[PDB]
Design a protein around this ligand. Structure first.
Ligand SMILES: [Fe+3]
Length: 298
């Protein structure tokens, strides 16, 4: 079976909005086409990123994360826990709110890197709003339910470089996990991403065609939608033949309210998840064998 394709051009109107529902229900991931981000900007994100990661280690470490919160920023794969078996180099940048940016962690070379990221992040923010408004409608909440919870909310840019692994094995790479976000927007450089999603025990490949985006909702959305849609467990395996690049835009909600299923979804529909503080939600998704939001089922 093929990866579901969702056309942002047509996301109003039952035909394409229902395609989104059957993709959220069956795959958890979907491929987004006609999303309004120009192809040459996506190319630049990928190419300038590759250029940043192919530098000598000394240049990259000038942006290395500092050590004295949970969401570490800068260059490295630390989480006294460097993640050697990820087989990956990483750059993590807080992009939103724009006020809270810290340019000491943004690469100054290639010269365009900052401007290209900020340009691409304006496009994915708009995609986030469109996707999330469609979902509110699917949930038969009103258009702007989440938009209000998305004000001054954190958004991170996670850049991944995966050099080839001569000895691929499942102990290497990104291990099975669900995202903690409200929404995740992923940009990959090639038609081999290594990204896989577990559906009813089975792992399926998630591949992007040229210049499309891979979207999934995270655990924040699953609690808020009372599990009507589920945050998918996924992993990124290693590759012996090619190098790979990706950028994930990681969209969370703000500190204001608490994380609980939407009241408008609760008498024949009891709440599947307990309410908890955004501060306790963060600590639990960063905080392991068992999956955090399971401990919220009740
Ligand atoms: Fe993930």
């Amino acid at each position: 079976e093929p990866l579901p394709v969702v056309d942002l051009s047509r996301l109003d109107g039952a035909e394409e909005a229902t395609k989104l529902r059957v993709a959220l229900q069956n795959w958890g991931f979907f491929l987004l086409t006609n999303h309004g981000v120009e192809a040459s900007l996506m190319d630049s994100v990928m190419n300038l990123s590759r250029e940043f990661f192919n530098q000598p280690i000394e240049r990259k470490q000038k942006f290395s994360n500092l050590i004295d919160n949970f969401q570490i920023q800068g260059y490295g794969t630390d989480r006294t826990q460097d993640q050697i078996l990820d087989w990956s180099d990483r750059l993590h940048l807080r992009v939103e709110p724009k006020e809270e940016q810290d340019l000491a962690f943004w690469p100054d070379h290639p010269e365009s890197f900052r401007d290209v990221l900020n340009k691409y992040a304006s496009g994915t923010k708009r995609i986030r709003d469109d996707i999330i408004q469609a979902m509110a409608k699917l949930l038969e909440l009103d258009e702007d339910y989440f938009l209000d919870r998305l004000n001054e909310a954190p958004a991170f840019a996670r850049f991944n470089y995966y050099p080839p692994c001569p000895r691929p094995d499942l102990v290497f790479g990104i291990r099975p996990h669900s995202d903690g976000t409200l929404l995740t927007i992923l940009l990959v450089d090639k038609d081999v991403s290594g990204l896989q999603v577990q559906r009813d025990g089975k792992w399926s490949n998630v591949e992007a065609t040229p210049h499309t985006l891979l979207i999934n909702l995270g655990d924040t959305m699953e609690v808020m939608c009372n599990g009507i849609f589920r945050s998918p467990v996924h992993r990124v395996v290693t590759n012996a033949e090619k190098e790979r690049i990706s950028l994930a835009m990681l969209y969370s909600v703000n500190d204001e309210k608490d994380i609980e299923p939407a009241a408008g979804l609760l008498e024949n529909r009891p709440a599947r998840y307990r309410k908890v503080s955004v501060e306790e939600f963060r600590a639990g998704i960063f905080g392991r064998g068992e999956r955090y939001i399971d401990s919220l089922r009740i």
